[PDB]
Every structure is written in structure tokens, then in C-alpha cells.
């Protein structure tokens, strides 16, 4: 019933945890609303700080809804910045596989 989301961040400079974490948060609400962040349930379970790169957990049928509201994300405090997702899947070792293992993950 849950699906998990791998992207990385387009940018000029580095963002911690928080950062995109909240980022993730304004997208959504924004994009879906507060009844539809709360269908999609989007959680931020991993960002790894070196990489830029992360991954999101969401509701099986709103996977694509929590993608196009990452893509709208124009900035993310203050600094010029786009979100892209490399793909989805099943579970998180399967996805960590396809898309993480070939930057700093395993």
C-alpha cells in the first residue's frame, strides 16, 4: 500500500535534512492541499546530505501526485533549486537498487 520515491536535487548549493524536508512538505500542501497531503501522506525517510540525494514515502495512489508537486518546486529557501525524481518502486532496498546503489548508497 506504500510506494517510495528516489530523487536528487538540482542546485547551486548544498541543503540539510530539514531543508528539503520541509521543502517536500510547502510542495505538497501547495500543490495538493491539506485534504490531498493528507490521502498522499508523503514522509521523508532518508536524505543523504553529501549527495543531494533522498528518499519520500507515499500513498500507492498518489504516487504521481507527490511527484508533480516536487516538479513545481521552483526554489527552496531562497536559493534557485529543482527536485527531480529517478524513479519509483515497490520497496526500498529494490528502489535503493535501481536508482541509489549508483551514487553513495547501498
Given at each position: 500500500?506504500?510506494?517510495?520515491?528516489?530523487?536528487?536535487?538540482?542546485?547551486?548549493?548544498q541543503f540539510?535534512?530539514?531543508?528539503?524536508?520541509?521543502?517536500?512538505?510547502?510542495?505538497?500542501?501547495?500543490?495538493?492541499?491539506?485534504?490531498?497531503?493528507?490521502?498522499?501522506?508523503?514522509?521523508?525517510?532518508?536524505?543523504?546530505?553529501?549527495?543531494?540525494?533522498?528518499?519520500?514515502?507515499?500513498?500507492?495512489?498518489?504516487?504521481?501526485?507527490?511527484?508533480?508537486?516536487?516538479?513545481?518546486?521552483?526554489?527552496?529557501?531562497?536559493?534557485?533549486?529543482?527536485?527531480?525524481?529517478?524513479?519509483?518502486?515497490?520497496?526500498?532496498?529494490?528502489?535503493?537498487?535501481?536508482?541509489?546503489?549508483?551514487?553513495?548508497?547501498?
Open positions: 500500500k506504500k510506494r517510495y520515491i528516489a530523487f536528487k536535487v538540482i542546485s547551486e548549493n540539510n535534512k530539514d531543508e528539503i524536508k520541509e521543502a517536500i512538505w510547502n510542495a505538497c500542501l501547495r500543490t495538493l492541499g491539506e485534504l490531498g497531503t493528507a490521502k498522499a501522506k508523503p514522509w521523508l525517510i532518508k536524505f543523504d546530505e553529501t549527495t543531494q540525494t533522498g528518499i519520500i514515502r507515499s500513498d500507492r495512489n498518489h504516487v504521481y501526485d507527490v511527484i508533480f508537486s516536487l516538479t513545481l518546486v521552483s526554489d527552496i529557501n531562497g536559493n534557485k533549486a529543482i527536485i527531480k525524481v529517478l524513479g519509483v518502486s515497490g520497496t526500498i532496498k529494490r528502489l535503493k537498487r535501481k536508482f541509489l546503489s549508483q551514487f553513495g548508497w547501498r
